[PDB]
Amino acid sequence: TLEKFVDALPIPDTLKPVQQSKEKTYYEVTMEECTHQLHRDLPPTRLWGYNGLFPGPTIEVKRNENVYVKWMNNLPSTHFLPIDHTIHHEEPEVKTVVHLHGGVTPDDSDGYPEAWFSKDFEQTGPYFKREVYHYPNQQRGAILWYHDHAMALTRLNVYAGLVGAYIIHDPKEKRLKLPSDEYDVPLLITDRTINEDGSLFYPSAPENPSPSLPNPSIVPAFCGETILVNGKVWPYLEVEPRKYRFRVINASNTRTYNLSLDNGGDFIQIGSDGGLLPRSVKLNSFSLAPAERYDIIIDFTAYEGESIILANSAGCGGDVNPETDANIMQFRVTKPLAQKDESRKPKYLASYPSVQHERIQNIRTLKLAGTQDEYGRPVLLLNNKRWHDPVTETPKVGTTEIWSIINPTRGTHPIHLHLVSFRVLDRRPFDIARYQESGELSYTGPAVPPPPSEKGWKDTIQAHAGEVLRIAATFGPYSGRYVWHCHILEHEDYDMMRPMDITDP
Ligand SMILES: CCn1/c(=N/N=c2\sc3cc(S(=O)(=O)O)ccc3n2CC)sc2cc(S(=O)(=O)O)ccc21
Ligand SMILES: [Cu+2]
Ligand SMILES: [Cu+2]
């Protein structure tokens, strides 16, 4: 039973380039088995870490900076977490590939799940093309993050510790004078279950498993008993009584958070997955599903001396427990001011999306569903296709589509499209039983436009149960072979992921 708020929040160091010039910035990152202590009272934990760190180093780039990262695997040939060998398939047991989540990235640098590699690239997957990924960064400033994306192993490799932040700074943002430097802090939130000996627990099977069930077996969801921020269990952060910017990243496998401050204070949302909102939005609470990012300002100016808990009210396999998962971290407003707070919390942030969208080239209707496998396990599917089935989502480069995502299942799925960001058009409830019985879509209420939080640009979006969600994206500027998928990792791996081919005629 781990005492809350006894370790300081780590802030990952900013990765330094191996080589840098005005034309090119070159980085190296090596995946390593490592050990770090996750709580004051735990023995050190075995982990897989980018450059031996959990989370990985934070990478900072400018818009249009010509960046190269050689992601290397120096991992052991056997996993320390339970591999289910029935969900896919001579290949190595341990395979890896890094996806820069949110990256406007050429397809062979996107971290395709079948572009994996084993240690030193000894073996490579069928869609591997290159060692050194290229990130031209021709996109709006935003909070990105990087993490493993290997076929059939993503839930394990991420849970092992392969996550890191990547921030794109646009020099144009600077006139806004948003909190910066030490007043701009990433918060990577990961839930974990940890054994008494300090080792990570990840389930090798569902509860009360039939003896015919593979062993190990995948589970459809995982809720951790403990919450970590930047690699420490329920940490505290000393802050100055002034404005801070936080880059809030949900890097958890399944868990959705619903965040608040326990003094009833407000957040100011300045940004979503895809960058700055056109206007700042004052929020008392916000939902944050796997792979979503909220760029927020918290103004501690009026709370000097106070301890304020960043709290959580979203359940995960049950109601939050006030003593455990209802807590994320604690702010202590006890750091003396190092200088005048010259930062701002502006109302006006950026241009609205150009109202003159392109013409709608196509409208895809897509269903979230699940069948059962030969062992009785749920298999989560996009439009009843398996990963290996021939590609059906085939937008043309430079064209705009609307995707209507129909969710008749009992849960929310956070759906991520690679390469692009998109606008959220609306959500609308429908008759679930009728849809299940006849395949016919009968709305039970009007279309609800998104909340202000979702009026800018998104790349990972919650599709709630009993709703049709509509989004719009322009597919470009690159063509090639990408993916879209649920970002509950346990779903992603079996098998709620599909190829997405962006074509050039
Ligand atoms: C919310 C406005 N909206 C859409 N926006 N799409 C946009 S706005 C936009 C701005 C830029 S730019 O800012 O980057 O240049 C690039 C691409 C853009 N796209 C295409 C993704 S598409 C749509 C359809 C319906 S309808 O279906 O109900 O008629 C209703 C309302 C709609
Ligand atoms: Cu899902
Ligand atoms: Cu992905």
Residue numbers in the entry: 2 to 90, 96 to 511
Article, verbatim:
Spore coat protein A (CotA) is a protein isolated from the bacterium Bacillus subtilis. It is able to oxidize specific laccase substrates and is characterized as a typical laccase with one mononuclear copper centre (T1 copper) and one trinuclear centre (TNC) comprised of one T2 copper and two T3 coppers. Substrate oxidation occurs at the T1 binding pocket and the electrons are then shuttled to the TNC, where the reduction of dioxygen occurs. The overall structure of CotA comprises three cupredoxin-type domains, characterized by a Greek-key β-barrel topology, which is similar to other multi-copper oxidases.
Here, we report the crystal structure of CotA complexed with a nonphenolic substrate, 2,2-azinobis-(3-ethylbenzothiazoline-6-sulfonate) (ABTS). The ABTS molecule unexpectedly binds to the positively charged hole in the protein. In the structure of the CotA–ABTS complex, ABTS was observed sitting within the hole. The novel binding site was approximately 26 Å away from the T1 binding pocket and was near the exit of the water channel. The ABTS molecule passed through the hole in a linear shape and interacted with adjacent residues by hydrophobic contacts: Ile408, Leu431, Ile366, Ala478 and Trp463. The sulfonate moiety at one end of ABTS formed two hydrogen bonds to the guanidyl group of Arg476 (Arg476 NH1–O48 = 3.1 Å, Arg476 NH2–O49 = 3.1 Å), and the sulfonate moiety at the other end of ABTS formed a hydrogen bond to Ser360 (Ser360 N–O45 = 3.1 Å). The thiazoline ring of ABTS was almost buried in the hole, and the two sulfonate moieties of ABTS were exposed to the external environment. In the CotA–ABTS complex, conformational changes were observed upon substrate binding. A 310-helical fragment composed of residues 359–362 was dissolved and the side chains of Arg429 and Arg146 were rotated by about 40 and 120°, respectively, providing more space for ABTS binding. In our study, the ABTS passed through the hole in a linear shape; the B factor of ABTS was 35.6 Å2 and it had full occupancy.
